[PDB]
Amino acid sequence: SVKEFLAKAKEDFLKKWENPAQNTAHLDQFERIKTLGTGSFGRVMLVKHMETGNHYAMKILDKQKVVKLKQIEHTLNEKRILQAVNFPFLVKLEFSFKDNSNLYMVMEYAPGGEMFSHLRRIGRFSEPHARFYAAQIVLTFEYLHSLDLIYRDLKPENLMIDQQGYIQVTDFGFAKRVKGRTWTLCGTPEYLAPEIILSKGYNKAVDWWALGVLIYEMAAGYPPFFADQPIQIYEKIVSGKVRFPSHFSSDLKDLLRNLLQVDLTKRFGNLKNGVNDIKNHKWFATTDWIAIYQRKVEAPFIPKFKGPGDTSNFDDYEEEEIRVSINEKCGKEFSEF
Amino acid sequence: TTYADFIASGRTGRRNAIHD
Ligand SMILES: Nc1ncnc2c1ncn2[C@@H]1O[C@H](COP(=O)(O)OP(=O)(O)OP(=O)(O)O)[C@@H](O)[C@H]1O
Numbered sequence: 280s281v282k283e284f285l286a287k288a289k290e291d292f293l294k295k296w297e298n299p300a301q302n303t304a305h306l307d308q309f310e311r312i313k314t315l316g317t318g319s320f321g322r323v324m325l326v327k328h329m330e331t332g333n334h335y336a337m338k339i340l341d342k343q344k345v346v347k348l349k350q351i352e353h354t355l356n357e358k359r360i361l362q363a364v365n366f367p368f369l370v371k372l373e374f375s376f377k378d379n380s381n382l383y384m385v386m387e388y389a390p391g392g393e394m395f396s397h398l399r400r401i402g403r404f405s406e407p408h409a410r411f412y413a414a415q416i417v418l419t420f421e422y423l424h425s426l427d428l429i430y431r432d433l434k435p436e437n438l439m440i441d442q443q444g445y446i447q448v449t450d451f452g453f454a455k456r457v458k459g460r461t462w463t464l465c466g467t468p469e470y471l472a473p474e475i476i477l478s479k480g481y482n483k484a485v486d487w488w489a490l491g492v493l494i495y496e497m498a499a500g501y502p503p504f505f506a507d508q509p510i511q512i513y514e515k516i517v518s519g520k521v522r523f524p525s526h527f528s529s530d531l532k533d534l535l536r537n538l539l540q541v542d543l544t545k546r547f548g549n550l551k552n553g554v555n556d557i558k559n560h561k562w563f564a565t566t567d568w569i570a571i572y573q574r575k576v577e578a579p580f581i582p583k584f585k586g587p588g589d590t591s592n593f594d595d596y597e598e599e600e601i602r603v604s605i606n607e608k609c610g611k612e613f614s615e616f
Numbered sequence: 617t618t619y620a621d622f623i624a625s626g627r628t629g630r631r632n633a634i635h636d
Pocket residue numbers: 315316317318319320321322323336338370386387388389390393436437439449450451452631632633
């Protein structure tokens with residue numbers, strides 16, 4: 280069963296969890312080609328492993344900047360969780376290392392760009408399209424939650440499309456292995472669940488609220504709570520007032536009403552039956568889950584990639600050179616990295 | 617329309633994460 284697979288998968292995760300991999304490369308093994316993306320904490324560069332000739336995405340965290348934004352424990356969770364995990368819709372971490380100035384996470388390059396890029400251009404996805412993606416995120420959270428992991432930053436900007444047109448969840452910067460509750464205010468304003476903003480202390484259920492936001496945005500072209508500045512967004516979320524486009528199927532409206540339930544005792548994903556209330560929902564009736572997991576479903580959108588190392592599905596960013604100090608900067612703080 | 621309000625808003629570009 281699914282229950283048997285998750286058990287095997289937990290053991291694999293624990294062995295890597297207790298004994299994490301470390302210093303398995305350095306900078307000069309890599310050709311820096313182009314910046315693929317940027318964030319609040321780090322930048323990602325397309326890179327080339329010079330001995331194998333493979334292309335990878337390398338995330339660069341500037342140690343000092345990590346310390347000034349109070350993300351040390353978060354950055355240590357990111358590397359440890361990511362090197363331990365193994366699912367078909369999670370990016371693979373191949374190498375990690377550090378030097379005097381920075382922390383590096385070389386990852387599987389995903390040539391299709393972000394879901395964000397395509398969703399904004401096209402405007403919105405058809406329901407069947409959104410469903411293809413939703414299902415994959417549903418299975419990915421089932422896996423992550425069974426390992427006591429919360430993800431905490433689901434957004435189109437962290438969902439890469441691979442060559443097969445499938446999802447690779449990237450960015451485990453707020454990932455955290457927790458049994459019981461957690462209180463850190465983090466995520467992305469539009470995707471924040473009401474518990475986070477209200478400082479209640481929260482659990483896995485915030486990922487399922489985030490899935491309901493994602494589905495709404497994929498299917499509508501816009502998030503269910505937007506405004507010009509974050510405080511107005513937080514206002515609408517807590518208000519627990521959503522309006523649906525008239526072109527949403529009744530089934531979709533119904534899925535979403537349970538996922539965007541402000542009352543986290545009645546929110547799908549957090550009930551007795553757990554993730555099955557979502558999987559056996561009317562909206563997912565056509566979805567063959569095992570097929571989705573095996574990647575033997577026909578993707579409705581395969582991005583165009585003219586050869587390897589093509590970056591035409593990513594925006595252009597301003598480049599910055601990688602400066603490494605002669606002196607080690609925050610050595611004690613990142614010793615386990 | 618809602619889509620039009622969204623498109624005239626300040627948050628149609630990529631959204632970075634918050635923190636403490
Ligand atoms: N493995 C990857 N392959 C291709 N592109 C990637 C990959 N990983 C990340 N990116 C790109 O880099 C961008 C920024 O990376 P990421 O979100 O992980 O950094 P971050 O500092 O945590 O940003 P934030 O927390 O604000 O979302 C992503 O939104 C994505 O466009």
